[PDB]
Design a protein around this nucleic acid. Structure first.
Ligand SMILES: [Mg+2]
Ligand SMILES: [Mg+2]
Ligand SMILES: [Mg+2]
Ligand SMILES: [Mg+2]
Ligand SMILES: [Mg+2]
Ligand SMILES: [Mg+2]
Ligand SMILES: [Mg+2]
Ligand SMILES: [Mg+2]
Ligand SMILES: [Mg+2]
Lengths: 98, 221, 258, 181, 130
RNA sequence: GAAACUGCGAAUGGCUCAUUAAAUCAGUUAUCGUUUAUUUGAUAGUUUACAUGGUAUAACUGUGGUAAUUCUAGA
């Protein structure tokens, strides 16, 4: 019965939250909040702009026209990372054009 | 009477007595092959049925019940974490015995057990006790539909908890003795069918214990 | 005609029902009942042309035979039952209670009320008289006869009738300063306060009524229904509170809310 | 029997159809606006006469009269909306200054011509009657359709029209088929 | 592609159904038959097909969109109970009753009006007479 | 559930304008001058009973008359 399977996945998912700690209840709403098309990451106030470590890296190519960045993400539906391969586990890549 | 409505008239609408409906009624959910809402699920059975019942039923009690529990049923893990409060509210509203709202509540109670079966075991005794009081209350006010809702919910709980209940069916039978021994023939008849599903699912070894206990009980209705 | 009529042409039907003039040739004739034919709203119009719950007469009949509609706490199964002013219509399955009160325009308005408000209605005392065996009784505007009335109750007073038991709970005397509702004439549906009651023996009495906006109008006593004291109505009022408003302002606030 | 359905005549014959100056006037109006017959001119004239007679009656009433204010304001709003009366001329006096040409320009035929979708007023008529012109998302085939200010910017070739991006009409594909064969 | 938008939705538990106006956008297509509209509505509202009724569909001038009225009963049995017989026959849920034309039935009614009683006595009387 | 008894309807609807010159009709009055099926609300401890008759018949069984009718005779 696939509902039992969801329960197992939910149960393991619940155990993660207990490790992550009211707090459990709120975090439960947050993870599914992607399904509900509404803002759910309220972190602007807690952010620290003034202490930002800024850096400028020169590049030979002229008129860098765009940049695309790839971030692996844990998927709540299957609880697996989005990395293409085991070597790319938690490796962040940026692509650029000029 | 003795010449029951074997030959049906051409009338599209006909009167039927409560005893007539009760005699025709039978408790076996599986034979019904109609499409079920809970068959298609995105988050949980409870949520799938919960949204639908909001659309069909407009009873005041159900509306109040929905508002209290709406926030805590958006996801299956949320249901698991808030299982205690959800069950208490469901039991609370069923006790009011408002026929306008019973049907959505009884269905959701079964679907609640569907989402978290093994966890429902701690709720099992209270759930059965609530149904027994309702069915006893249902005798006072005539409504065949109420009996149909109540016993199917009882049948549904048996289907989902079939594995665990079978192991201790004597305990489950012990709860239903007032129903099986009740003065009314139909209430005993309906309960017997619901418990019959568990019996046919039993292992032979477990069955031998159950048959011994009932025969010991045999030593009104 | 050689006897009572049983058909009603659409053009001859009451205007305030707001029936299409081309939908058919005949309109529902209200059966005999509490209210007069021209001052009554048959249940078919209410369920079909107002609530839009039923699409045609047959579906209205299907609803009624299911016994889901109650009028004044009693189940009615007649399609053309003449529900009228201050009538309570209860739909349990849908869980609503409606009170039939005219709007400012002069038409019965779909006004939803709470259960505690649906438990009672108001009746204008049309007659008071001793019945057989010396038992006093009062006849209201909806044909209700209540025996053993309070002696102070007289004609033109209002009585608060509890639907479950059909007994008077409270009453209002007809006096200056009382809040009144117009049930006839081109001022139909307006609300105001009594100012003076002009009497003419052997003729129709006239009553002066002042609205909240300070406008004054005169109306025959037969069209006046006391509903409470100023600022304290005993029933929930429809939107607009029975205030007549001009046409220019009507344009104005329609634009404003639009 | 069922209640009557009202009807009315949208045009009236003139007091003297035989005035030579008049005949020349309808010749101008038909020629410039490509009107099929005189009945169209008479219809527009009748509508305009009704409008201006109402305006005159409203003017006769004293200023600040509620009827005057309400009905004059409604008439000015409608005339502005259809576009005959310009925004800066919102007074009943200028309504009396309207002319048949103002209404004629607002016809969908003339507007189609002015927008450049057609090379002649007659080309506009044949385009409209052939279901090639759409105001907004809807297709209009009636040359007498009156365009509103908002609708004016939405006139375009219909999606179903071959000129509007649909497949070629029957003649084009017939010719292509024979050429391929 | 074809899109179905439901508007003016009302929930009628008196009749145990949901009423609405169905607007169907069907670019590059003549129109959508009632069958496809029924199966799509049944999928959208998660009900049995037999519980969905649709009718009164009119395509506007110029094509591209249609408007009709749609009903969704809470279950099939209620659909059988409330739906008009002719619509049931359209969907095949019910079988058209075969009856003679009105003139034939009326003539038979008149002829049976002429006879009194069972009429067998007249039959034997005329048999003996002739 | 045919037939018949019983209850209700058939006095509504549809059509036409022949007669009609204070008549009809329009507006406006009156019933302290009267009937009112039906709906709605009240309203009857004061009148062999574990329940009376054919003072009775239809439908029905059967015997018939008339050229003929939505005719009907006897039992
Ligand atoms: Mg008097
Ligand atoms: Mg085309
Ligand atoms: Mg009779
Ligand atoms: Mg004559
Ligand atoms: Mg004479
Ligand atoms: Mg006279
Ligand atoms: Mg009757
Ligand atoms: Mg009575
Ligand atoms: Mg005899």
């Amino acid at each position: 019965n696939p509902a039992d399977k969801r329960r197992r996945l939910a149960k393991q998912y619940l155990e993660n939250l207990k490790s992550e700690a009211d707090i459990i209840a709120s975090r439960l709403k947050e993870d599914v909040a992607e399904q509900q098309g509404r803002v759910f990451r309220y972190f602007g106030d807690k952010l620290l702009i003034s202490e930002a470590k800024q850096s400028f890296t020169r590049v030979g190519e002229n008129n860098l026209t765009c940049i695309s960045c790839f971030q692996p993400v844990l998927n709540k539906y299957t609880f697996e990372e989005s990395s293409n391969g085991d070597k790319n586990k938690g490796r962040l890549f940026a692509y650029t054009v000029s | 009477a003795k010449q029951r409505q074997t030959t049906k008239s051409s009338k599209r609408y006909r009167y039927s007595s409560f005893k007539a409906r009760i005699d025709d009624l039978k408790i076996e959910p599986a034979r019904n092959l109609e499409k079920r809402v809970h068959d298609y699920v995105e988050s949980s059975h409870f949520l799938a049925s919960f949204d639908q019942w909001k659309e069909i039923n407009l009873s005041a009690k159900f509306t109040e019940f929905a508002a209290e529990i709406e926030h805590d049923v958006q996801t299956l893990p949320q249901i698991l974490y808030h299982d205690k409060k959800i069950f208490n509210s469901l039991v609370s509203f069923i006790n009011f015995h408002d026929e306008f709202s019973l049907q959505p509540l009884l269905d959701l109670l079964a679907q609640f057990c569907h989402d978290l079966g093994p966890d429902f075991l701690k709720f099992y005794e209270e759930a059965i006790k609530t149904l027994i009081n309702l069915l006893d209350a249902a005798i006072e006010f005539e409504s065949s539909n109420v009996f149909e809702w109540g016993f199917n919910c009882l049948a549904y709980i048996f289907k989902y908890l079939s594995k665990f209940l079978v192991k201790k069916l004597v305990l489950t039978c012990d709860l239903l003795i007032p129903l099986l021994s009740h003065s009314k023939e139909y209430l005993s008849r309906f309960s017997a069918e619901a418990l019959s599903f568990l019996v046919r699912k039993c292992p032979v070894s477990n069955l031998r214990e159950f048959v011994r206990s009932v025969f010991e009980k045999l030593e009104t209705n | 005609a050689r006897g009572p009529k049983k058909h009603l042409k659409r053009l001859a039907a009451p205007h305030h029902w707001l029936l299409d003039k081309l939908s058919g040739c005949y309109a529902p004739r209200p059966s005999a009942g509490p209210h007069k034919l021209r001052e009554s709203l048959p249940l078919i119009v209410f369920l079909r042309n107002r609530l839009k719950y039923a699409l045609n007469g047959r579906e209205v009949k299907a609803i009624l035979m299911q016994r889901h509609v109650k009028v004044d706490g009693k189940v009615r199964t007649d399609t053309t039952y003449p529900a009228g002013f201050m009538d309570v219509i209860t739909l349990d399955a849908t869980n609503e209670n409606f009170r039939l009160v005219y709007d400012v325009k002069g038409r019965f308005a779909v006004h939803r009320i709470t259960d505690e408000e649906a438990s009672y209605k108001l009746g204008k005392v049309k007659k008071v008289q001793l019945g057989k065996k010396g038992v006093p009784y009062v006849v209201t505007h909806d044909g209700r006869t209540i025996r053993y009335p309070d002696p102070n109750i007289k004609v033109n007073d209002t009585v608060k009738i509890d639907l479950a038991s059909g007994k008077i709970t409270d009453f209002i005397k007809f006096d200056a300063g009382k809040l009144v509702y117009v049930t006839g004439g081109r001022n139909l549906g307006r609300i105001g306060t009594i100012v003076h009651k002009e009497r003419h023996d052997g003729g129709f009495d006239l009553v002066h009524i002042k609205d909240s906006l300070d406008n004054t109008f005169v109306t025959r006593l037969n069209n006046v229904f006391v509903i409470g004291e100023q600022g304290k109505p005993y029933i929930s009022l429809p939107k607009g509170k029975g205030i007549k408003l001009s046409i220019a302002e009507e344009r104005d606030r329609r634009r404003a809310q639009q | 029997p069922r209640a009557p359905r009202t009807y009315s005549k949208t045009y009236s014959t003139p007091k003297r159809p035989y005035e030579s100056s008049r005949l020349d006037a309808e010749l101008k109006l038909a020629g410039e606006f490509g009107l099929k017959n005189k009945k169209e001119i008479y219809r527009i004239s009748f509508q305009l006469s009704k409008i201006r007679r109402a305006a005159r009656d409203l003017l006769t009433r004293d200023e600040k009269d509620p009827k005057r204010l309400f009905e004059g304001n409604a008439l000015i709003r409608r005339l502005v909306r259809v576009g005959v009366l310009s925004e800066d001329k919102k007074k009943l006096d200028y309504v009396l200054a309207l002319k048949v040409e103002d209404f004629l320009e607002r016809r969908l035929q003339t507007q189609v011509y002015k927008l450049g979708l057609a090379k002649s007023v007659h080309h506009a008529r044949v385009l409209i009657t052939q279901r090639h012109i759409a105001v907004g998302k809807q297709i209009v085939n009636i040359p007498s359709f009156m365009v509103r200010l908002d609708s004016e910017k939405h006139i375009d070739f219909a999606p179903t029209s071959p000129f509007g991006g649909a497949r070629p009409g029957r003649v084009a594909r017939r010719n292509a088929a024979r050429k391929a064969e | 592609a074809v899109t179905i938008r439901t508007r003016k939705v009302i929930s009628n538990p008196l009749l145990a159904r949901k009423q609405f106006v169905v607007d169907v956008l069907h670019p590059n297509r003549a129109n959508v038959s009632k069958d496809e509209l029924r199966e799509k509505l049944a999928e959208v509202y998660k009900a049995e097909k037999d519980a969905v009724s649709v009718f009164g569909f009119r395509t506007q001038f110029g094509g591209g969109k249609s408007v009709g009225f749609g009903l969704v009963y809470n279950s099939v049995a209620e659909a059988k109970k409330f739906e008009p017989t002719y619509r049931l026959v359209r969907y095949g849920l019910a079988e058209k009753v075969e009856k003679a034309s009105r003139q034939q039935r009326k003539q038979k009614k008149n002829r049976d009006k002429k006879i009194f009683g069972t009429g067998k006595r007249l039959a034997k009387k005329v048999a003996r007479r002739n």
